């Protein structure tokens, strides 16, 4: 569930969703309705790409097993959806981490008249 | 600035702003594109109304001064715009806290298919 999505994205990155994220850039701080102006906005974008494909789950609900070993996360033993949606998070919460040295600060709660149209999955 | 809003949220409510007040509803969690649900919902609608009065100000990035030693924000020294954000923070927060009683999980990740039109300040 989303709860469980922003421990991820803490633990990988040292900042909490709110608002270092939520309020980021085009896509991640604007209802995924601009263009993604960069890596880090990407990673929302790929993020509601990855649960559009769990059309039989919900995602923002349901709740699933992991741990880490290794400093990588291990999504555990679950329904098929539980499995699904933790890889979706796991992999949004690894691509934020990646994309760090690129963060830029003055894209939080960018004005959104700057922002382009967006494309699909 | 944002990040004082946020922990504001969390010292009021006992909840992060993630994701329990960004994806609440459809002002909160539908970037002020519906019409606010609930009184937790119209917290976020008065916020961005506050925020509007500021129009000589930076909401978003000016770090203002605050303290809440004995169970209420008090809003510190600063520049006019340090506190009149602080007090519509303040007032968000407050906001939040008092309306927890009517709370409900179901309005996080709400289906904004089911958003009405909204109204203006």
Known sequence: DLWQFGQMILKETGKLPFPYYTTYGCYCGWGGQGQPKDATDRCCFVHDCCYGKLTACKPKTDRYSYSRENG???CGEGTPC???????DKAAAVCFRENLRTYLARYMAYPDVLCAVPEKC
């Open 82 to 88: 539980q499995k699904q949606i933790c890889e979706c």
């Open 72 to 74: 990588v996360i291990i």
